[model samples]
Target: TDVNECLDPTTCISGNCVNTPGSYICDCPPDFELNPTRVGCVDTRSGNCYLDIRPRGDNGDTACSNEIGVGVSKASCCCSLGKAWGTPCEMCPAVNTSEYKILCPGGEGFRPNPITVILEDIDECQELPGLCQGGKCINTFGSFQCRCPTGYYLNEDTRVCD
Candidate 1:
């Protein structure tokens, strides 16, 4: 008998699970892919993917331990696309300090405070402007891009369609 494995809540865990003859296949979103376990999903932009957790009244350093398993004082930030997270995301010495301003810069695609031990990424494609004047803006991790329209080409420097 063919069992609809997808009917089970834990079938795919985090993605769309297709019921096969006797098993199931998992599929993730456009920017995500199936993990090695073939049952979970991971963000393609970053090697790791997780939700977020913290202490009751205060939070501690997130990098002390790195794993999906939840823990007290352990750290994990769910940085969305067009935003930064984890070790790759640069952290500032302190908020509003000289280094903070230097690191966050014009605040276009960068942010500050990041709750320490971690930084943040801004959606330049949404927050700021002058991007892809004649093209479509696609926001991705750490960057934004201009998608050329049909019958048009993207100008790298001007971020316009030529």
Candidate 2:
């Protein structure tokens, strides 16, 4: 009776060790670089090969190459694509638009106090003195009318003396 070592299959480091007549040959797996030191294979990218690579927890490996069992850390919670640290889609009023300007209170440019939903325009001629010099002031809804004095043409666009 002859002792056949090949009869019982055994696992090796990512290689096929086939038995010949009396010896065996080792072949490294695909996409792996064979280690010259001994019978072992390494990953081609990082030269570190492993059969099972699973993430442990939030502190696990952060290498973007490995995607299995990955977890998000607190520091990187808001690091998703198209999103910033704070509320990215916040609906704050625009600075240059009428919504912001009409809603703002205090100071010389803004109204004296905050108004409710329906924003009523300030009577520029009456609110701010000397706005339309020597002109008759007429208050209207959400706006005011100023009839400039004779001889001076009022530029309606700029509301200035022409």
Candidate 3:
């Protein structure tokens, strides 16, 4: 009936949660993200969003995390804007650390710089062929899957359009 802070969305401070049965509370220190357990904080600039940690490491070493990604689109990973991020944002590299330095597969010979990949989800429904005439479209990694509904079956073209 009343403002149900309990049911309200506080997607921020994954670690901090205190609902007084009628409302909610915010309890996170300045500039940090609460871990899933709602007790600890996550370092955004370094710990998360990074594909590679080791700087200038030889490719021979598999330890170096690679950031090779497809699509290279905008990120949905929540982030704080200013004055000590106290929301769902996990990191803010813009002010927390220096700009990211990326190195592609090819040595320094490559002419153009490869687009850096950010954490994000692509919506197949927004892409082409979303509405299936005879089936449904399921989202997948780097692509979408066309399938026929329970009553309908995939046509000979395998396009799921019936």
Candidate 4:
């Protein structure tokens, strides 16, 4: 039988641990990256990492929309390099039309500063409750996935266990 190393707290001290058939892997959070050694995590945004849009296909527009949620524009949500870590790039429609000043201007999942804005990928799996509906929810950059646990099957339409 394959051992589940993920059960041990000592594993993946700096990142989330996943257990496979005979091995396991570590996954860094959105704000962090896997270090060169691949044994630890690193913080290296350099103040220029922003969420950019991607073209249609795998890890593209359709996936981004489903990963984050509804109403997300096609030209947004994909994480990419380059941008003023925290600042206004895309103005919200309501804010523009009402001529109102807001704190976090980029809309949802972004932090705010007095003059600039900080864009951080929100961990949707942890933020929203009941999102997976009895399934495991794995978080990704600006997105997430609903996975079925052992002995359960995923119901695509309901996004839950079948």
Candidate 5:
């Protein structure tokens, strides 16, 4: 049966289900788990978040976690993408030490201690200044793009005037 799973909203209860040719994939959020039905999204168990992607270090001694898990010693730092979790630290002595900042959105306890882990992607239109011409520049998750009016298309490498 050529079942277009995405046709049903229940196809991805936990994440957005993208339908491709003969296949579909559920892009689950950071830690949510998908049930056997591939539609039931369940929240996983919470942790102290100590060994949280400790992907940097000094003199090759890289480990972000420590003996303390909960309590006041929740290592408050983050790692770049493509990095692994380990015994983390409040300060990674690698680069840009003065740029360290923390944001405790949920009032802070011991979940993700005031660390700016995943930063928002830069908007090319704002950064570059005058990126889009005809339509507009929409800033998305990891990148920015120039959109066009409904009748025409925006050239991939160039622009499109109305």
Candidate 6:
């Protein structure tokens, strides 16, 4: 099989090019950085050099440098150069509750936040549309009371009258 050479002008900013059987390597000229993604040896010391990788098209085998002190540390195992360092990868905040009004009342805050204790009963009967189906819902301190209709009983799992 014949080897394909990926020609990139920026690969070796100022260097000698030696073509091999299947690949070509760039031997950086004096006072140049060996890695394209890092600050190469400069005439004078320059601190904290940053190079953004935005290649025009796909260049085979010519990877943006993973140099130390660059976009991402070479030692970092999980994160890529694209993502910012130390940013946690987790889902954003959202509501996942069955009883919407009871759990997250109009002015009250919901889960993922600190749990708040109700010092007094909520009196679900006073609140429009009681949570219990075909039954009366009475809110007590730290608990709720459900009274099922004539022919129905409360479901232990959901506390809904059926």
The top-ranked prediction according to TM-score is 1
Best by lDDT: 1
User: How many residue pairs clash (N, CA or C atoms closer than 3 angstroms) in each of the candidate models, in the order given?
Assistant: 1, 0, 4, 1, 6, 1
Query: Across residues 19-119, which tens digit of lDDT does each residue of candidate 5 receive?
Result: 87787887765434564656444333322323233344542555544321222212221222111122333332233342212221112112121222222
lDDT of 6 at 141: 41
Candidate 4 lDDT tens digits, 1-162 = 999888887565346788888788878655446655554443443221223323435442232222223233211222211111222223222334321122223444433221122345655565442346688788776567888888999765545588
Worst 10 residues of 2 by lDDT: 74-83
Worst ten-residue run, lDDT, model 1?
A: 68-77
lDDT, candidate 3, 31-134, per-residue tens:
34444544333333322122333334533433322222222211211121111111221222342322111111111112111122222334334422323345
Full-model lDDT for every candidate: 0.45, 0.34, 0.33, 0.43, 0.40, 0.32
The global Cα lDDT (0 to 1) of model 3 is 0.33
Clashing pairs in 2: none
Clashing pairs in 5: 53-85, 63-87, 64-87, 64-88, 65-87, 65-88
Which pairs clash in model 3? 12-88, 15-38, 78-89, 79-89
Decide which is better by TM-score, 1 or 3.
1
lDDT of 1 by residue, 1-162 (tens): 999988887565335788899788987645345766676544434223222223333434342222221211101123222122344322223445643333343333444322331235555455433445677887765667768789999765444588
**Residue 35 in candidate 3, Cα distance off native in Å:** 32
Sort the candidates on lDDT, descending order.
1, 4, 5, 2, 3, 6
TM-score of each: 0.32, 0.27, 0.23, 0.30, 0.25, 0.23
Select the stronger candidate by TM-score from 4 and 5. Answer: 4
CA deviation > 4 Å runs, candidate 6: 1-130
Error of 2 at 94 (Å): 4.6
Backbone clash total for model 5 is: 6
Residue 107's lDDT within candidate 4 is: 44
Regions more than 4 Å wrong, model 1: 1-101, 105-109, 113-118
Candidate 3: stretches off by over 4 Å = 1-122, 156-160
